[PDB]
Every structure is written in C-alpha cells, then in structure tokens.
Amino acid sequence: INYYKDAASTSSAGQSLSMDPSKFTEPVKDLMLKGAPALN
Amino acid sequence: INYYKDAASTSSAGQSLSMDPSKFTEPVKDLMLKGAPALN
Amino acid sequence: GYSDRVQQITLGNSTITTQEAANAVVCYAEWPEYLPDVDASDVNKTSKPDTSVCRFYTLDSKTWTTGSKGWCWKLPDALKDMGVFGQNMFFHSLGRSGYTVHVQCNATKFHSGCLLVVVIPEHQLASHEGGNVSVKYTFTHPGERGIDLSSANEVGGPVKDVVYNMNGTLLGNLLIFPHQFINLRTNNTATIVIPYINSVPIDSMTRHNNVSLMVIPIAPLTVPTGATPSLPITVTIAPMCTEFSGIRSKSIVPQ
Amino acid sequence: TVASISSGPKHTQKVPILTANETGATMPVLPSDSIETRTTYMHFNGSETDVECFLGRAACVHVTEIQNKDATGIDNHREAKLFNDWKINLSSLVQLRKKLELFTYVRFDSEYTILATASQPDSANYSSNLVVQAMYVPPGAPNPKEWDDYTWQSASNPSVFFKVGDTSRFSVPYVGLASAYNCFYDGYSHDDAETQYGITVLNHMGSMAFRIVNEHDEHKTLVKIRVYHRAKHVEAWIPRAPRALPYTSIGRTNYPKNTEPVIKKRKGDIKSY
Amino acid sequence: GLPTTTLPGSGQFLTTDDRQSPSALPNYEPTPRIHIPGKVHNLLEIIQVDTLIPMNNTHTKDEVNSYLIPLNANRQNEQVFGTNLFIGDGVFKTTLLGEIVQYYTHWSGSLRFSLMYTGPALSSAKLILAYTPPGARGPQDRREAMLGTHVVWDIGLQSTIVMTIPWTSGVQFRYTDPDTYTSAGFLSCWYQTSLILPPETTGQVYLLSFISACPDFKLRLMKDTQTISQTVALTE
Amino acid sequence: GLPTTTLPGSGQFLTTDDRQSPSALPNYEPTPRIHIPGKVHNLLEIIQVDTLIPMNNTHTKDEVNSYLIPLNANRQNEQVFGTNLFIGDGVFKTTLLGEIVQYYTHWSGSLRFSLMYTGPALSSAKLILAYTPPGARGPQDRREAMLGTHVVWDIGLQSTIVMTIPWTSGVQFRYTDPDTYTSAGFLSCWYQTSLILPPETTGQVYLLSFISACPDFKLRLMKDTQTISQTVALTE
Amino acid sequence: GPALSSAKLILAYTPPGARGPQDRREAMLGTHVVWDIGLQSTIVMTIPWTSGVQFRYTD
Ligand SMILES: Cc1cc(CCCOc2c(Cl)cc(C3=NCCO3)cc2Cl)on1
Numbered sequence A, B: 001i002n003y004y005k006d007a008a009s010t011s012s013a014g015q016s017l018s019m020d021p022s023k024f025t026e027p028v029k030d031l032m033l034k035g036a037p038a039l040n
Numbered sequence C: 001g002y003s004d005r006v007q008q009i010t011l012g013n014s015t016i017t018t019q020e021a022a023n024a025v026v027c028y029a030e031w032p033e034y035l036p037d038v039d040a041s042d043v044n045k046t047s048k049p050d051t052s053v054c055r056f057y058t059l060d061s062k063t064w065t066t067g068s069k070g071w072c073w074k075l076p077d078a079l080k081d082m083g084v085f086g087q088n089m090f091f092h093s094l095g096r097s098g099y100t101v102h103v104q105c106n107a108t109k110f111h112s113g114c115l116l117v118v119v120i121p122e123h124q125l126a127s128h129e130g131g132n133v134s135v136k137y138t139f140t141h142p143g144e145r146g147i148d149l150s151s152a153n154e155v156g157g158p159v160k161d162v163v164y165n166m167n168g169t170l171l172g173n174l175l176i177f178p179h180q181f182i183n184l185r186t187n188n189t190a191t192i193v194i195p196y197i198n199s200v201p202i203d204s205m206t207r208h209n210n211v212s213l214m215v216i217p218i219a220p221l222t223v224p225t226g227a228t229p230s231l232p233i234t235v236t237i238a239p240m241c242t243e244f245s246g247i248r249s250k251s252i253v254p255q
Numbered sequence D: 001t002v003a004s005i006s007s008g009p010k011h012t013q014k015v016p017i018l019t020a021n022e023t024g025a026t027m028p029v030l031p032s033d034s035i036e037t038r039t040t041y042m043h044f045n046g047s048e049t050d051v052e053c054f055l056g057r058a059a060c061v062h063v064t065e066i067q068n069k070d071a072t073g074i075d076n077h078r079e080a081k082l083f084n085d086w087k088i089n090l091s092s093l094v095q096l097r098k099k100l101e102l103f104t105y106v107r108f109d110s111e112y113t114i115l116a117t118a119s120q121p122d123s124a125n126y127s128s129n130l131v132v133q134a135m136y137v138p139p140g141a142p143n144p145k146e147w148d149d150y151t152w153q154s155a156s157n158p159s160v161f162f163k164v165g166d167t168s169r170f171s172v173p174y175v176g177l178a179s180a181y182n183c184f185y186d187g188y189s190h191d192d193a194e195t196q197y198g199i200t201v202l203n204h205m206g207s208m209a210f211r212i213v214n215e216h217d218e219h220k221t222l223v224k225i226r227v228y229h230r231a232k233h234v235e236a237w238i239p240r241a242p243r244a245l246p247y248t249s250i251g252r253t254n255y256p257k258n259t260e261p262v263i264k265k266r267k268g269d270i271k272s273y
Numbered sequence E, F: 001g002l003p004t005t006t007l008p009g010s011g012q013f014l015t016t017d018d019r020q021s022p023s024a025l026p027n028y029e030p031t032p033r034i035h036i037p038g039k040v041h042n043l044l045e046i047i048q049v050d051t052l053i054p055m056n057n058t059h060t061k062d063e064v065n066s067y068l069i070p071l072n073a074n075r076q077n078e079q080v081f082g083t084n085l086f087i088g089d090g091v092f093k094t095t096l097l098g099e100i101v102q103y104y105t106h107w108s109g110s111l112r113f114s115l116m117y118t119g120p121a122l123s124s125a126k127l128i129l130a131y132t133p134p135g136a137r138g139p140q141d142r143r144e145a146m147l148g149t150h151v152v153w154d155i156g157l158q159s160t161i162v163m164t165i166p167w168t169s170g171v172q173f174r175y176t177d178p179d180t181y182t183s184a185g186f187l188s189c190w191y192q193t194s195l196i197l198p199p200e201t202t203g204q205v206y207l208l209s210f211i212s213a214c215p216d217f218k219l220r221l222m223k224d225t226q227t228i229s230q231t232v233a234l235t236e
Numbered sequence G: 001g002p003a004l005s006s007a008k009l010i011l012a013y014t015p016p017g018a019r020g021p022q023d024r025r026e027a028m029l030g031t032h033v034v035w036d037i038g039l040q041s042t043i044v045m046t047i048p049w050t051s052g053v054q055f056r057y058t059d
Helices: C083-091 C171-176 D051-055 D094-100 E090-094 E096-101 E142-146 F090-094 F096-101 F142-146 G024-028
Strands: C007-011 C014-018 C062-065 C071-075 C092-104 C112-121 C179-183 C189-194 C211-222 C230-247 D002-004 D059-068 D083-086 D103-119 D131-137 D159-163 D167-172 D207-211 D221-239 E002-004 E068-071 E079-084 E104-108 E111-117 E126-132 E149-154 E160-165 E186-191 E205-213 E218-222 F004-006 F068-071 F079-084 F104-108 F111-117 F126-132 F149-154 F160-165 F186-191 F205-213 F218-222 G008-013 G031-036
Touching: C007 C092, C007 C230, C014 C092, C062 C211, C071 C230, C083 C092, C083 C230, C092 C112, C092 C211, C092 G031, C112 C171, C112 C189, C171 C211, C171 F096, C179 C189, C211 C230, C211 F205, D051 D094, D051 D103, D051 D221, D059 D083, D059 D094, D059 D207, D103 D131, D103 D159, D131 D221, D159 D167, E068 E079, E079 E090, E090 E096, E096 E104, E096 E205, E111 E126, E126 E142, E126 E160, E142 E186, E149 E160, F068 F079, F079 F090, F090 F096, F096 F104, F096 F205, F111 F126, F126 F142, F126 F160, F142 F186, F149 F160, G008 G024
Parallel strands: C014 G031, E002 F004
Antiparallel strands: C007 C014, C062 C230, C071 C211, C092 C189, C092 C230, C112 C179, C112 C211, D059 D221, D083 D207, D103 D167, D103 D221, D131 D159, D131 D207, E068 E205, E079 E186, E104 E218, E111 E160, E111 E205, E126 E149, E126 E186, F068 F205, F079 F186, F104 F218, F111 F160, F111 F205, F126 F149, F126 F186, G008 G031
C-alpha cells in the first residue's frame, strides 16, 4: 500500500533479476564459441 | 480514505489539468488565424 | 576460409585491411546509431555529413621503445583538426558521434611485447599536485598529439603515473573497460567500435571529451638480437553516425 | 538451477580451455570443462548483490554543527555557527563515495534521515529542548544571512522542523538536470583556459541550511547534525575500476603525492605461498 | 489494541507534506461560489502572455524609457541592441516571465521574442534579429550574427515580428539563476538595410520588445524568489 | 480513534530498513531517461569479467612489473610462481574480484584463473598449473603438485589457458577475510618441459595472469571494505 | 620481401583539385587503403572514377 502520492516516496525497488554479463564479458563483434578455436 | 467528516479537512486537491491560456493570450473579439494577415 | 584474423573495414572513401586481427570489440555490445526522436530534446533538425566526416583519419605515429610508459588520446579532441569532421565540430553548438578505432603495430615472430588498447568512458584525469588543484583545459585537449605518459609533470597538467590510470585506480583493472590486447606473437592490430555514451542526448564537442583511448605497453617490447630497439604504433580513427546541431558562428577555444 | 552438471572423462579435438585473451572476451569456462564433476544445485539467487541492494542502505554523508546562543552582538551568524549549511554533495565522506564511483552514471531517488543530538560542554542547569529547521535553498534562492531572516519563512522552499535528539526523514525525487548523475565528467563548464575541471562544476544543486528555532537560554547548547542518505530506485551504467588511492577533494579524481604502495609486497618470493 | 512501531520522522513537520486534519469549524457552510471571469489554473497559462522587456536598461533610475529601444535613420551595417539570455536576470528579470521563472529552479523550452515598430507609417526599415546558441561569443558584427538563428524583419503594415529562440541544448534543463554550463546564448539585432524617415520627419524612432514562453516550456522544482525580502513583519 | 500499542524498537533508525517517506518536492517531474549502453544490474555481472593479478608482488613500490610473471629459458622441473587462495587478501586483493569480494562477508563458487603467454611466436613451452585443495601444504615440487587439480598447458597459437579452481569444500561458504577453517588451498605453476627461445632471441619472457569468478559464484552478507578510509571530511 | 618480415603501407588516391600530397596526413584525407602485408601477397586499390566531365583526354 503506498500512503503517499509521489513515486519517489515508495520503498526500495525489488530485484532486477535481470543479469546479463555478456555486454561486459563478451563484447566481441564475431561470436566466439567455447571449444572452437579462438583464432581461426 | 477520509478520516474526517468535513471537506476542509481533506488533503490538497489534485491537478487541474485544465490549462487554457486563450482567455489571457487571445481575448480578441474577431478570431485571428496564425499565418493570415493580422490586419486586413 | 574466413578467419577471425583477416578483416576489411570500409567507411566512407577509406578502407583498412588487417591480415592479423583478434576479433573486434563493440563497446557494451552496442553499435553506434543516430539519435532517436524519443530521446531528443533540442528541437533543431541535425546535420549528418555522412561520408565526408565518417571516414578514417590516421593520427601521427608513436614510437614504442623499451622505455615507453603509454599514450592517451581524448575523443572528439584527437580529431578536432581532421578535414570536415573538425570544421563541423567548431561550427555547431552540439554534435554527437560513435567511432571505429583501429590501433596498428606489426613486428616479427622474434619480437615480444604486448600493448593494452582500452576505451574509458568519462576519463576524468587527476592533477599531480593533489588536493583540489584542477587540470587546465589545454592539458586535457592535446589534440592529435595525445598525452605521453612518459613526458614530465607540467603545471596545470594531469598526473602521468601509469599504474594509476591517471585517476587513482589500478592499471590491472582497466580490463573492466572495453579493450583488446596487441600481443606481437598473436595480434598486430586492435579494433574497437564505440557507440555514443553520455548522460545527455547530445552535448558540446569542445567542452567535454567522452572517451579517452589509451594504448599502454604492459609486457615490455623485446626485439631480436641486434634489431633496432623500437616499433612505431599508428592509431587510425573514424567518426561513425556523426550528427551536428545548432550551427552558428564558430567556437573559439583556449590556446 | 544447476551449479555444476555431471561430466566425465574427455579426449577431444574440442578444447574449451584454450582461448586468446587478446580479443577482449572472458570466455565462460566452468569446472566441468576441465575436471570430472557431479551435479550440484545453486540454492541461491544473487539477491543481495543487486545494485538496488548495494546502494540502498543509509550511509552517513555529512556531519555539521550549529549552536544556540545569544546572538546579541554577533556580526556574522554564519560564522558563529548560529546556523550552518552544507553545499550539498555526496563526495564528502568516502565510504559511500567509493561504492558509487564503481559506476560512471547513476540515477536514483534519495531518502534523507537527519539525526540531531545536543551537547552541553560547559555547566548548564539543564538540557533545553530545541527544534531544528532544515531548509533547502535551491540555487538562485535568497541565502539566509541571519538566523531569523525572512528566508527562514521558506514559503516556497521545502523545510522540515524536528526536535533535537529526534530524527527527520523524507525523500527526494531524482533532481538531476540530465538523465542521470555524472559520477565522473571529463569536461568543463565552458571553453575557458582557467575554468575548473570535473563534476564539481556539474553538481551545483544549491545547499541545505540548518538552524535552531528556539531563542537562547542562559547556557550554550551545541547541536551536531548528521545527514544519512539512502538511494532508492537505483539505475547504474558503465562499471569502472574501483578506487585504489585515497581521495583528496570533493569532485576531483586527484590522489595525494608520495602516497604508499597500494599492492601488498610479498614476504618472500614469487614462489612463496 | 493493535501493535504498532513508529518510524524515524515521526512528529516532524515538513512544510510540503499533504495530509488530513480535523476541521476547527465542524459543520460550517462556506459561501456559494458565483462565476468570475479569469480563472487561472497553471502558472504555465500566464507565462504565455507577452509583456514588455526594459531592454534599454542604460538609465540610472527606473523610467518609461528603458522600455524603448531607439533606432537611428540612415545607419547601415550597425548593431541595434544585444543581451545574453539569462532569463532569470538582467533585462528579463522584472518581466512576468522572468518573475515567474524565479519561483522555479530549472526551465526548458522555447522563448518567443517579438519587436513592435512604432515609427511614422511613411518610414521603412529592414532589421535582422539573431539568436546565437551557446558555445560562441555574443556576435560582434552582423556577419558573425547572421550565421546563427536569425529572421530578416521587413517593417510594414504588419507592425510586429515574432522571433522564437528555439530550445538548443545538450542538457534538457537549464538553471533559472545564471549558470555557465547551463547557459543559453545571446540575442542581437542589426540594421539589414537601414531605417529611412519620410520628409518633414526627424529624430529617433523606437521599437517596443516583448517576451513570453512557447507552449514548449517547462519549469520545475519550486523555490523562493530573490525578488522580495523584508526586515520586520509589516503591521496594519 | 483506533486503539494501538507501540512495540520495542519504536523510534529507532536502522540504516537497512526500507519504508515509505513523504516527498519533499511534491509533484516534481524528473528528467526523462535516455538510453545509455552499459547498464549494470548485479555485482555478479561484473565479477565475471577478468582482470590482471599483480602476481609478481615482490617489488617495493607499485609498478607495471608486478603484473609480469617472468619465465626463464631452459630451466627444467622448476617452479614458476605460488600463492595461497585468500581471494580477499594478498595478490587478489586489488583485482576487481578481490575488490568486490571485500564488500561481502562470505563467498562460495568456482574461480577462473587464466595465463596469457607473451613470448616470441617462434618459442615454445609446456607448463603445469596445479590447484591444491585445503588440507595439504603448498606443493614443494611438481611431483607433489601434479597429484591435485592440474592442467598441462602447451603454449601455442592459442595464447591463453583458462584454469578453473573448482569449488572444493566441506562447508558451503568461506569467509572473504582470510580464515583458517575456511581456507581454500594453493595455486602453483611449474615447467612441464621448459621454455625454449628461437635463435637471435634472448632473456626473460612474461606471462600475464587474470582472475574472474565462474557463474557458480555466490557472495553474501554485505559489509564495509577495509580498502578505503579517511581522517577528515573532504571539501571542494 | 622475406616471408618472416611485416609491413603496413597506406596507398592514397587524391582526386583532381588538390596538389600531390606532401605527407601522409595530407594523403590520408582522400581515397586510401591501409594495406597489411600478409599471407595474401597483393593488394588491389581501385581509383574510382571521380569527375565532373564524363570523359577525360588520354593525352
Ligand atoms: C548526487 C546528489 C544528490 C543530491 C540531492 C539533491 C538535493 O536534495 C534535497 C532536496 Cl531537493 C530537499 C531537501 C530538503 N527539503 C526539506 C528538507 O530537506 C534536502 C535535499 Cl538534500 O545532491 N547531489
């Protein structure tokens, strides 16, 4: 129950439960498959 | 939920969301169209 | 017979071929794109010179020697004088751009050495004076020359200490930024595609640089016996999806 | 969810453990690519590492102090701490600072808690009960010159009145100019040759001003204000390397000269355990 | 008895909170409303009405004359007036727009700047108005001025010209109190050809100038105005 | 009036509680969000990116050189480096992994340790990396080392080798600050055959080493880092 | 050159209207190809037809 009118006044947000490290761990242009050779 | 009986005791009103500047910006008797000459 | 290894990038009226690549990085897995209306604020129609600004400019070459500490360029600064890209830059109030960066360094199968090529969004430098000394404008706008981390402290300039990234963080952790290594034994180029990254939809190109490109020797250069002890490093960079807006009189900037 | 699958002997032409780090990727290698594993489940979600959780607890961001005393003959209230201010900023204290600077841009609503306690360091008959008044002077607003000015009227300025010893709490929407707060800014206000450098030029959101409503009693009373800040509704972009050297200034990245080696030297060889 | 816990902030008085209260006058009946022309709902409604700018600020005590921008016959190439666009300060500051902007911390949007000509009907003139977006200096000559937002105004039967300063900005809000990073540009005006008076006529002619906000406009984060203060409470 | 009772804890301020509060700025409209590449949601997303380990810690002031593990041509049977696995201390401590682990009290999971070789292309080498699970001493010779988790690495075209320290543990969580009961083992590396340089070449070659966490990893019970402190508040 | 050597050259075409370039900076602003000497021994640069008039004289 929100007792207040504005959105800033609500409690903390709830877990992204998004999670996708590939923008950080695999930003390569041509896709690399694990097990296939790195450099062909 | 109002806890009180009288109307003065309720919280602030809620946004007019009315908004019509023409009584102030265009109080002319004969309607002016933008693009048409001001004085004919 | 496609290898990760050979590549061709054609952009505008200029083409680059590498026969010894190590894939390419696209920052944060996003490719440069123009500014959508839903994200727009300034009401001005923007100018998109296209092929006259989105081509490859090769900056002047550096020389890696056994004593090198590393070099640093800022964008869009490094290009402030390249062809029509630069003119547009000084002439509009606002502009926006992504880039393809291609760093080149070839040697032979007897050399060793490994450079880190990294792009740091919003690289705010530190004053070597400490306290709250600022880093004057000119010092953070070296132009095509870039900053040479093995040059001496100057007054009003930034600190040039490598194991601290010019800001109080350790060299070792620069790997959290989009980056690629050039290991003479593997690699001969590094290519990074940079999407436009800012907290505003379009900004000024002269009062704010939005990425520093940094090339840092990490495993020292080691040449074969009686080889000349140095290799040149060349940086070629191409603006991509550039847009300029708010045209007028032509900025005058310090120094 | 499985944390590890079962995997047995391998004799392949398909080697997942050989890679080329020069590419910039961190290939997702697992225990089961190089030893024989058994199934195990995760039993865990990663709840407490969510950025909302990481930045979402109150941190002390500021300690100031004001006193209640006879202002008779004081030529400069501000200077007598008849009332103080704090040109708002979250770079003051470094505990919460390091956490925030793990990211480049950050966007969130703030919840402030303000604790005020009183001290009576010299002989008093009693402890008086004072009421504090915290008013946020938005930039371009009449700055309190005195302690009972016309400014304190704050007829358009959000202000809160609470008792010393007690706490005040509220929340503020994200009042950033841009789409997010710039944790770092490699630019200037304008193309000048002497203009400052950093964010200290970007983060100019006025200041908060405190004062004691009560007049003065016979003794003097020191009131010390602690402001706590909790981020709610957090959004963070572009991770960066953590801060290694100590901080010297609000808003610049500068570290102190002749600082000490931050990497612990081995007591022994590279070979040492 | 239901168990409760009180949180931090209990008992505080926040001048901006909005809650219910007991009525001191239970059951009282207010006077009926009758109709009155002119109801205002938003301050955004009124900042779109234009008001005069004391552009000619050069006097030494407030006078009707600082509303008049003078024009000289037969000058060529030269500059009529110049001003920066810090709407919360300087010429703008006493105008209704300036005066309201000052109740808020941030503004964004387009401005409408118009000039009404008052010279004899048998005279003629062509002026250029130029808006210079942030980043360059106030133009120093028309050549410089004409390369940015501009309108050649031809003085005719239609007495006023409405120039718009379109919102040109990186950051989507600017501060109303003058700030650098956040600065908006300059506005200048020059002779395009020149003012020409008919025979039997002489002297200076004046332009009146107005400012109002486009429907585009946004103002946010209310605060107190530097435009009013006091030293003791008033009495009757 | 509804009857209530207040419980123990009323009026306390717990920095970790999460409740509603009145907004000081009623009705204010925040700036629109625009798109920015790079959004982070979990610290678990970032500790999977590998970063360099200053393994060569033997210097006396921080230098680029403590990231370089040297290799000697023609040595046989010998040991390249050794370290315990207290990820919250020692070599690991300044790495991004080490640096984040320090914000939490407990960790569990697999680690990924990789080595990238930088020697001339015409050289060759075979190294063995060994993980020794808790309970035995740091191995003293390869024979001892090779009886635990190990990988023979053959230096080739493929420049890096990724060793995983699989989670070997009785207790399902270990403390990030070094603790005995909770200790994780040792990591050592030895020549399997030996480094061989081509003609016309000489000296030391170096390995770079990285550390990142497997997707396996769990961190819990947040706390304050020993990695940052201060003596007076900073100012502008 | 020997197979164990390496080199990177830039070839530049300068369309009519400017002088023969005097340094690479000047050269690199017109049609150009960075050539990386590798296994593939030849590089084919095209001088695309850049012209106002649709024919040029051979003399
Ligand atoms: C980063 C960052 C975040 C902030 C906060 C902005 C200022 O927020 C406040 C507002 Cl809008 C109001 C009040 C306030 N109103 C009544 C009492 O306090 C206090 C603060 Cl800190 O500044 N830098």
